[PDB]
Design a protein around this nucleic acid. Structure first.
Lengths: 116, 121, 142
RNA sequence: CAAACCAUGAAAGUGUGGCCUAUCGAUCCUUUAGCCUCGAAUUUGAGGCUAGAGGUGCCAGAAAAGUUACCACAGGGAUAAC
RNA sequence: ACUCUACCGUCAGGGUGCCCUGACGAGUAGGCAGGCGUGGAGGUCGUGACGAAGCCUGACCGUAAGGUCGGGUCGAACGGC
RNA sequence: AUUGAACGUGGACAUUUGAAUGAGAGCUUUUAGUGGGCCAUUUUUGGUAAGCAGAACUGGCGAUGCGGGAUGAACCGAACG
RNA sequence: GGGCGAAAGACUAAUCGAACCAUCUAGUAGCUGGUUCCUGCCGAAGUUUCCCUCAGGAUAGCACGAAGCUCGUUUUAUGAG
RNA sequence: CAGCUGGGACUGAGUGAAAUGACGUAAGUCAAGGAUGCUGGCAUAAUGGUUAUAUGCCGCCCGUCUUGAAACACGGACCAAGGAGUCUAACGUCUAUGCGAGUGUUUGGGUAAACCAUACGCGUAAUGAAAGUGAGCGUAGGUUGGGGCCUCGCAAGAGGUGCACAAUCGACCGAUCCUGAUGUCUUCGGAUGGAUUUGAGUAAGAGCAUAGCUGUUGGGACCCGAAAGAUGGUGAACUAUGCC
């Protein structure tokens, strides 16, 4: 029936956005990551070389580290086989930013004992 | 599986273990049942390393399987060895080094408590 | 030879009822393609050629002795068969091997202890000569 | 990412020819160029990287056409008249 | 089923001899363990012509497997260990 | 330049008494089996003329007691030594 | 594979489109059928990458057998009709 | 409430125990913890037994294929004979094991099933279309420093020697460090989980032989059902054709 590869099934994950069409601004372009930054993913046909895969969008993830410099960097995410170390390669523009709220729970909790 | 001497050594070890236990009474008891590789033939080259330059010759080696007698173990390293089979070289060269070659039967007679003990694979 | 399990089931040597020569897939199998046999998408088969065959490795190829420098040495600080210059062993004195065989080197590895022995062999390998020379020796002839 | 490394630019600068976006051929072989391993022994016969020739379209590849009813044998609604 | 309490199956832990005792136990392939099995035999004494195997018939423990005793009868064979 | 980490070093951050460690899930590996199934519930592409034919999701049977149903594996209640 | 034809491969010991008898020969059958104790522990699967490949089988999915160890209920969010 | 009313469940009785309990009494009961009797299903050592048998109610039996046959699928009159995974023999886990860092053989000798001999094995070499080496049972790869040797040319510099030592990285052993409980003390010692550091060895497979077992390639090869080839005989007794 269908062939695989590019736009099949999840055409939106290949696609840009109608509202946010046109060339991508210098938001996630210049925002490079390091160890333990939680991030998201959504592609486009705006960034040609270093486009991530469509099946491995939908999933969230965390950045392992940025390896050497900016490009050739990785995002960790599980694939639905079973729990396994799986990642995905991409360059900077496709990577987003998310929940840095949860880890600040420990620093909030530590204001405990000195209230005696 | 039934080694006539070794399955009688199970009923020896449990009789001591369920009264005056040792950590060598725990580990070696499982490996009286278990198979070929799980009864390791330890060489006296790996005893010459582990039991005295690195690790302590205070800690006495309770060998699980047999004792093979590699090289010609010198007057410098040594430990007191107890095992299943003891070979002619181990009856010579361990005595030359400065230890006894005993047996697991006599560990129950000597001191089942494990004050200064290790095993070796 | 489990007569009890085998004769009172008749599955031993067969499997399920109609398994005939489909199951072992004939007997043997070839190189390339054929129907319903044990060939399929196998990983063995390919290359074929057995043996490390070359015109150098055949007749008149003289064998080496099993002869390390330290494996020879271990018997020496016990036995006083050999001579002592520094120490001074022979090749074929603590060792068998290089009686009949054509040449006789002194060979292999191990990060060498400080043993100033002098060996009396036919030839020498590259292995032993550097190690033993650093320790404080050399090869001597027989 | 770093070196090799020529011509362009004030420099910053970004790419191993391409706007996201289908577009072809193995073992076997063939023959050629680049040049690391050889039989007293100076050469040389014989033999293993890599790159290219050649519509094997089923794209993962054996020169080249068949009625089959005198008739024999083993199987099959895996398959049909019905 | 629900539910009471007991009983049957392997295994664990505490402490041997094994007992307490948890959780589950419909069943085909299949593997392992355990138990019953023929011909034969190193062994072989024990039983025998004052009655052996066998034939035939009765008693006949209980885990599914099939085996000891006893009666009518045999006219030489066969098991402790 | 700077980024990223480990050590040195200060602070934030709970304690008394007695005894001791639970799995309903992961990983490794020798000597088998499957490699051809049925039905009910629900939605899709599709002939709502038909059991035309295809894709998703779920229970029981396959390998299940017993009761209900005049007769009927799937449903209802439900688990069996 | 010869004998033979005005033809029908009629004909040759009831066998002739290749006589009959005996041997190698127990040829061989990728297909089908049949196939011998018991209980207990314990027990799945009809799914797949892929094939000059299709009543098969390399591999993978799922539980065999044996040794040594292995959950979640749910809370904050993030991504996608 | 035992007014009254129906049951499961427990204690106890000649003689006559041990361990874990409570309350009460000049008394004892509950609670514990010690101990049944006959058939029944039916394979191997039971009561006085085989058994015709009214009336009434339950009530559809297999080896095999398949999701699926008591079924109108196959397969017995009935009894006895014969028979369907197996004494070859290779590989790999494992049981048992004399003996092990060297051990264990064989022909044969011969004290004859004994005992002696120890030839010789034991998981075994990278890799370059054509210009070497032979790796310690077998022992290599990746990266790098030091040094020995030869040739050309102006020692300007270019090329192998990196075969090998060794430096250095890795499965991993063993040590080291830390968390909480923790014997024992402000001193040593035991165990567990995780991580860093640091020292060192083995193709890390750290023994060979043997009785034996397993599934399978092979072996009388699980038992059964074919059409068919080559080779050597015998048939024109019948019959197609020939001739007189």
């Amino acid at each position: 029936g269908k062939s695989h590869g590019y736009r099949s099934r999840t055409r939106y994950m290949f696609q840009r956005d109608f509202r946010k069409h046109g060339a991508v601004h210098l938001s996630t372009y210049l925002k490079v990551y390091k160890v333990g930054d939680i991030v998201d993913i959504k592609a486009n046909g705006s960034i040609q070389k270093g486009m991530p895969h469509k099946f491995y969008q939908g999933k969230t993830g965390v950045v392992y580290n940025v390896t050497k410099s900016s490009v050739g960097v990785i995002i960790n995410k599980m694939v639905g086989n079973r729990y396994l170390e799986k990642r995905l390669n991409l360059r900077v523009e496709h990577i987003k930013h998310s929940k840095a709220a949860a880890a600040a729970a420990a620093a909030a909790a530590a204001a405990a004992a000195a209230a005696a | 599986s039934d080694n006539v001497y070794l399955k009688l050594l199970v009923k020896l070890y449990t009789f001591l273990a369920r009264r005056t236990d040792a950590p060598f009474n725990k580990v070696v008891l499982k490996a009286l049942f278990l198979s070929k590789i799980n009864r390791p033939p330890v060489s006296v080259s790996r005893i010459a390393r582990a039991l005295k330059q690195e690790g302590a010759a205070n800690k006495t080696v309770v060998v699980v399987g047999t004792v093979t007698d590699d090289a010609r173990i010198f007057e410098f390293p040594k430990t007191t060895v107890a095992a299943l089979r003891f070979t002619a070289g181990a009856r010579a060269k361990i005595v030359k080094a400065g230890g006894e070659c005993i047996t697991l039967d006599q560990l129950a007679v000597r001191a089942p408590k494990g004050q200064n003990t290790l095993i070796l694979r | 030879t489990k007569t009890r399990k085998h004769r009172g089931h008749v599955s031993a040597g067969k499997g399920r009822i109609g398994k005939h020569r489909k199951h072992p897939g004939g007997g043997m199998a070839g190189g390339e393609h054929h129907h319903r046999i044990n060939m399929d998408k196998y990983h063995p088969g390919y290359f074929g050629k057995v043996g490390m065959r070359y015109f150098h490795k055949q007749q008149a190829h003289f064998w080496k002795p099993v002869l390390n420098l330290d494996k020879l040495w271990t018997l020496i600080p016990e036995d006083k068969r050999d001579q002592y210059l520094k120490s001074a062993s022979k090749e074929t004195a603590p060792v068998i091997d290089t009686l009949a065989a054509g040449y006789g080197k002194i060979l292999g590895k191990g990060r060498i202890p400080n043993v100033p022995v002098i060996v009396k062999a036919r030839f020498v390998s590259k292995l032993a000569e550097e190690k033993i020379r650093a320790a404080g020796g050399v090869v001597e002839l027989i």
